[PDB]
């Protein structure tokens, strides 16, 4: 079963559940940050995400409403960092409390990246890349720098410049991504749990007149689980490459008709992948299998790990045989079973979606990923169990908030949130 660790932000660096870690894009730069291990292979780093931004992007300011909310002071004290961390702990326990979400955590924890990427020759395992390992500071912060590369699957940061813009991020080298090519790679996320999204694209509103339309705010656990689905795809190396999908019509479940990444439509579930032609859908399937072919071909040729002695090649060949559901024969050499590939492909791509997770957790979400951006709101206190719980989110029976998702209804539960204006 999945265990969610507990800790305080000021807890000492013991190098068990709390380390000083150099994250992938900061490799060899010397930038370490206090990291907290919420689960095996999953870390929370309560810092702002800065890589690829200008430092003045965080400070943007001016009667209008914009879709992007900025607040440079977010996470700017240790007490703020600790609130972020405790909120993240609570969101993860929320996810764990149904079989469906605990299973998600487990496939993410077990979904280990291949030891290498496209640059590594077929013969070798190499763990000395930013997408397989991060640097752990093993010396005392007072002493001359000594470090050790550890494995990891997911590292969650606080927001970049735009707070309500949560995003899952893969590692790219020379225009290629291990996370999109069969290998898998360490995944990253910029996440902000109390600045949530608002939506009115719900089927009840479809007939409705303009001043009769309902408005809801999202459950942050669902916002997170959606991001964790991208994370799962990136770990199994099947996260869909740049492929915008253009609809040939507004359909009944749609609200807008803008192009959307195919990765998003599979992640959302519902009816969203019906927009994708079967032709493009088949080639996505074709490409994954080709990538998995490239992986199994490596597994038959790997002789050595060049970076880490104490790595047992036999053990790991077996772990990957489990990850990818490869079949073995009497030579000891692996191969693909297409019938067994289809089971694995389907569960990864269609088994976890935002749509079925919302249904299973009794959470109101939007009717389609093709929905307008609305201004986000701020959830006042997710840590207060009168407002938000682990078992039922905002939709608490004991406060009569369970019926028709009133707990998420902007017109009903106005004490849960405030306008960001």
């Amino acid at each position: 079963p999945v265990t969610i660790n507990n800790f305080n932000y000021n807890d000492p660096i013991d190098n068990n559940n709390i380390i000083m870690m150099e994250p992938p894009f900061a490799r060899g730069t010397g930038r370490y940050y206090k990291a907290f291990k919420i689960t095996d292979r999953i870390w929370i780093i309560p810092e702002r995400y800065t890589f690829g931004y200008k430092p003045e992007d965080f400070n943007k300011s001016s009667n209008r409403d914009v879709c992007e909310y900025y607040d440079p002071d977010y996470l700017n004290t240790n007490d703020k960092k600790n609130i972020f961390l405790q909120t993240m702990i609570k969101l993860f326990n929320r996810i764990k409390s149904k079989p469906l979400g605990e299973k998600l955590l487990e496939m993410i924890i077990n979904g280990i990246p291949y030891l290498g990427d496209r640059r590594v020759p077929l013969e070798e395992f190499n763990t000395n890349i930013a997408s397989v390992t991060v640097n752990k500071l093993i010396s005392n912060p007072g002493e001359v720098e000594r470090k050790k590369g550890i494995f990891a699957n997911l590292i969650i940061f606080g927001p970049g410049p735009v707070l309500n813009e949560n995003e899952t991020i893969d590692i790219g080298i020379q225009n290629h991504f291990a996370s999109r090519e069969g290998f898998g790679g360490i995944m990253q996320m910029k996440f902000c749990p109390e600045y949530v999204s608002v939506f009115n694209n719900v089927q009840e509103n479809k007939g409705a007149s303009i001043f009769n339309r309902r408005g809801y705010f999202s459950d942050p656990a669902l916002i997170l689980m959606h991001e964790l689905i991208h994370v799962l795809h990136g770990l199994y190396g099947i996260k869909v490459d740049d492929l915008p999908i253009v609809p040939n019509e507004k359909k009944f479940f749609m609200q807008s008709t803008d192009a959307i990444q195919a990765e998003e439509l599979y992640t959302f579930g519902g009816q969203d992948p019906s927009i994708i032609t079967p032709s493009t859908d088949k080639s996505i399937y074709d490409k994954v299998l080709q990538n998995f072919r490239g992986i199994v071909d490596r597994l038959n040729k790997v002789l050595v790990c060049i970076s880490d002695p104490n790595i047992n090649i036999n053990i790991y060949k077996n772990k990957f045989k489990d990850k990818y559901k490869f079949v073995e024969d009497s030579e000891g050499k692996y191969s693909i079973d297409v019938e067994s590939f289809d089971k694995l492909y389907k569960s990864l791509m269609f088994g976890f979606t935002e749509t079925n997770i919302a249904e299973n957790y009794k959470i109101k979400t939007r009717a389609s990923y093709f929905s307008d951006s609305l201004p986000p709101v701020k959830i006042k206190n997710l840590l207060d169990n009168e407002i938000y719980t682990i078992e039922e989110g905002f939709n608490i029976s004991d406060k009569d908030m369970e019926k028709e998702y009133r707990g998420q209804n902007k017109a009903i539960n106005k004490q849960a949130y405030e306008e960001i204006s």
Partner: nanobody, 117 residues
Framework: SQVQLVESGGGLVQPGGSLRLSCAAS????????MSWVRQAPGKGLEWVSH????????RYADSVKGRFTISRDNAKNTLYLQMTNLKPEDTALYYC???????????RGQGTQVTV
């Protein structure tokens, strides 16, 4: 919208005295960035002195100033500190403040301060 780094704490002190340097940052979230002190001496190339991480847990010094300098930040007043002790002639230079670490120095730099022992 842009960044500003303005440093203070300058001029002759006798060897080996002490001197505190300071730097005020504006225009970006100070608490979210590693910061470095770098100095330029006469005839010599640019030399990195020290750096400190977002929350002050990580400190690094050049071996040239290790027993003598301490690096500090106050994320509340948006101020960066370099405390200079046991000052030597070797230390006479133009002291800059700039973002990032020894190994990733970043473009933004302050006006500079002169220190002369």
């Amino acid at each position: 919208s842009q960044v500003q780094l303005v440093e203070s704490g300058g001029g002759l002190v006798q060897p080996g005295g002490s001197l505190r340097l300071s730097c005020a940052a504006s225009g970006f979230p100070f608490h979210a960035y590693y910061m470095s002190w770098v100095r330029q001496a006469p005839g010599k190339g640019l030399e990195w002195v020290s750096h400190i991480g977002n929350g002050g847990i990580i400190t690094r010094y050049a071996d040239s100033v290790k027993g003598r300098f301490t690096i500090s930040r106050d994320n509340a007043k948006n101020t960066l500190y370099l405390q200079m002790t046991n000052l030597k002639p070797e230390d006479t230079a133009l002291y800059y403040c700039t973002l990032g670490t020894r190994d990733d120095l970043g473009p933004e730099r302050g006006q500079g301060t002169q220190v002369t022992v």
